[PDB]
Amino acid sequence: QKYASIVGVDLLEEITKDHKVLA
């Protein structure tokens, strides 16, 4: 974690709709 800090590494519902449109 000192090393990493120095080098800079890190460690469906379109049918229910279409019906309700008709209604």
Place this chain on the structure above:
Amino acid sequence: QKYASIVGVDLLEEITKDHKVLA
């Protein structure tokens, strides 16, 4: 792969329908 070659081994939408039928 020589051995294998000698011995012969190897190495949903029936609801959207039913509505459109009604319509």
